[PDB]
Design an enzyme around this catalytic site. Structure first.
Site, PDB file in Angstrom:
ATOM      1  N   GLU A  16       0.801  -1.216   0.000  1.00 18.68           N
ATOM      2  CA  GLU A  16       0.000   0.000   0.000  1.00 18.68           C
ATOM      3  C   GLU A  16       0.837   1.271   0.000  1.00 18.68           C
ATOM      4  OE1 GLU A  16       0.915   1.531   3.094  1.00 18.68           O
ATOM      5  OE2 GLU A  16       2.069  -0.297   2.903  1.00 18.68           O
ATOM      6  N   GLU A  27       4.643  -0.314   1.069  1.00 20.51           N
ATOM      7  CA  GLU A  27       4.726  -0.451  -0.392  1.00 20.51           C
ATOM      8  C   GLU A  27       4.771  -1.885  -0.895  1.00 20.51           C
ATOM      9  OE1 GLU A  27       8.075   1.641  -1.861  1.00 20.51           O
ATOM     10  OE2 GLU A  27       7.513   3.550  -0.921  1.00 20.51           O
TER      11      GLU A  27
END
Ligand SMILES: O=C(O)c1ccc[n+]([C@@H]2O[C@H](COP(=O)([O-])O)[C@@H](O)[C@H]2O)c1
Ligand SMILES: O=C(O)c1ccc[n+]([C@@H]2O[C@H](COP(=O)([O-])O)[C@@H](O)[C@H]2O)c1
Ligand SMILES: c1ccc2[nH]ccc2c1
Ligand SMILES: c1ccc2[nH]ccc2c1
Lengths: 346, 346
Positions: free
Chosen positions: A171, A314
């Site tokens: 994310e 991420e």
């Protein structure tokens, strides 16, 4: 969505048994390769892997979105960083891009609610320009959560039809460790103080405010811990919903998913609450340095393989663990056998 | 050997400072990549790496040898397995061979004392056909230990001249967790009972005998804990001495060495006792499932990156962690910078 959840396949115990027998016969003391062996067996149980531990193409799905709770002063990173970093994702300069390239995996950047103009090159699935401020109301409607779960689920499975056999989840969204903490608190029944961390370098003096914001989000929304979709829609976010959808999609297509850090733990708690059948497909990667990591992992009964004190997000930890999954497969297929060397152990 | 130890270079603090500054400016919250950052800085301090974290060719050195203490019933694996497995090493079918291939590293099999006829394809540095039974006397003479340390040290450094920049260490030798336990007990001052494990599946009922054997080895030899060479020659073994020599050699050539499991911890304790200047070059890989692992690691002040419950040896854990070292280098060189994106964080 009911069909989706209903059709999640159960692990193939037959293939798992053949796997164990084969692993036990390899050139080494039985069980000496430990977790690498249990991992290989877990993979063999996944229907989409065709009865054997194998890895074809690898993909990391990164869900990007902004959060209204950012205005409550729970994050020191400028809000625009979400949009900027999503663009960098398309240039291959971010942490997950570099680690994914090292692992031979492709990164998919999906915008599920960034508060900025559309970014070219980024998969567009935006629900809205950022979700509602969970401090004063819900992040989104139940329908918006369900629709995104379905959308992301299909996308994930569709990739499976293109050769992808291993997924990584990630994310990007300033302030997202706040809704993640709220969710963890609600699913595990732990007090906010025990689960709230510093996220992306939040000053120690601002922690108290963050803990308060989490409590208010819960008191005002009253999310039902027995309804994962209710929790995600009330105190979660678009990015967290999307991560949950990747997990339901991969599970539906019978494939493995590598979790990342703290945010992914939250989404995984939600996914398992929504459909327990998803659990067998989840594979931990690393142990996040976020404060509430230990608690979240305990309720998922997971023990990460990597202790890197990482807290970037991420999907970087996910990419970093892909070589491990491939190692289990390499062990399984390339090692020699005891019998072939006339070696007999008690 | 005195020259060897005297010429071990100190870490380059200047290069380490430039590294930190650069890492702090990458596209991510400062310190968010945690241990991957500290690793990159550690590598930058190593003179043989030319002021930057980088990995050229990779090699795993596997030291093979037999032990006279095998006759004391401390191992359930047939003694011949050492010779058989060393041969398999040349065929690429062993656990370390498969994991090394996955990491793009070459395996070097060195015979420093296998009790069998010479094996073609294996580097020959045998001291004798197995070392003495440490239960009734010393494993070898002090001179034999010193000569092997020197021999292995030169060999290791010589490879550096062929492009190798990252070393992994490993062993092969039935019964070697016994002398390894004795060494750990002596260096850390822990009782034998706290450091003796099941090694390669030793039945729980045979543990007591193993603990007794370790105590007798220590009482009869009286190794001096302040003299690492004295300890290695008395209650160690050829394979353990060779692993120690790889570490002194790499340190002398200013290059990094990846430890493996329990046996490598013993050798690392000896190496650091012999020359403290070696410590900065050691990089942990995984956390061995052997009972005495926690204690050994504590006295080395090391925290492994991988928790795989592995206990095979051969340098398998070392090979499995090589991708991690390369990841730190990839992070350092391929990530973008905050300034280039106009991102400013408090
Ligand atoms: O993955 C983790 O464990 C993780 C832990 C802390 C922070 N993060 C990252 O930092 C952001 C969330 O931090 P924050 O302070 O804005 O809530 C988000 O974009 C994540 O990618 C990620
Ligand atoms: O590396 C470890 O941590 C490790 C832990 C336990 C056993 N081993 C391997 O098993 C052998 C030693 O076990 P043992 O019972 O013969 O003393 C030796 O050949 C090692 O390669 C290796
Ligand atoms: C028995 C069989 C294979 C092995 N590889 C390393 C130790 C060992 C023991
Ligand atoms: C600030 C700068 C870069 C980042 N990448 C992920 C979160 C984050 C915050």
């Amino acid at each position: 969505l009911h069909a989706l959840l209903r059709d999640i396949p159960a692990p193939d115990a037959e293939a798992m048994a053949r796997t164990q027998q084969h692993i036990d016969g390899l050139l080494k003391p039985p069980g000496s390769l430990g977790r690498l062996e249990t991992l290989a067996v877990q993979l063999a149980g996944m229907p989409g892997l065709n009865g054997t531990p194998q890895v074809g193409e690898k993909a990391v799905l990164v869900m990007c979105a902004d959060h209204g709770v950012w205005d409550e002063g729970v994050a020191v990173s400028p809000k625009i960083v979400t949009a900027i970093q999503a663009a960098n994702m398309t240039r291959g300069t971010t942490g997950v891009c570099v680690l994914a390239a090292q692992a031979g995996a492709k990164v998919h950047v999906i915008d599920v609610g960034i508060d900025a103009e559309p970014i070219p090159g980024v998969v567009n699935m935006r629900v809205a320009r950022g979700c509602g401020n969970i401090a004063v109301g819900p992040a989104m409607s139940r329908l918006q959560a369900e629709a995104l779960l379905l959308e992301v689920s299909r996308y994930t499975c569709d990739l499976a039809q293109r050769g992808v056999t291993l997924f990584g989840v990630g994310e990007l969204g300033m302030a997202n460790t706040t809704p993640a903490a709220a969710m963890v608190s609600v699913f595990t029944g732990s007090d906010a103080k025990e689960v709230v961390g510093i996220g992306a370098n939040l000053p120690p003096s601002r922690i108290d405010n963050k803990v308060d914001v989490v409590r208010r989000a819960i008191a005002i929304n009253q999310p039902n811990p027995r309804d994962g979709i209710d929790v995600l829609s009330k105190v979660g976010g678009f990015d967290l919903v999307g991560m949950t959808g990747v997990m339901l999609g991969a599970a539906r297509c019978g494939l493995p998913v590598l979790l990342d850090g703290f945010l992914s733990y939250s989404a995984a708690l939600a996914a398992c609450q929504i459909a327990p059948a998803v659990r067998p497909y989840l594979i931990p990667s690393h142990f996040s340095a976020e404060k509430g990591a230990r608690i979240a992992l305990a309720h998922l009964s997971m023990e990460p393989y990597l202790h890197m004190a990482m807290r970037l997000g991420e999907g970087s930890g996910a990419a970093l663990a892909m070589p491990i999954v491939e190692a289990a497969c390499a062990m399984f297929h390339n090692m020699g056998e005891l019998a072939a060397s006339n070696i007999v152990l008690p």
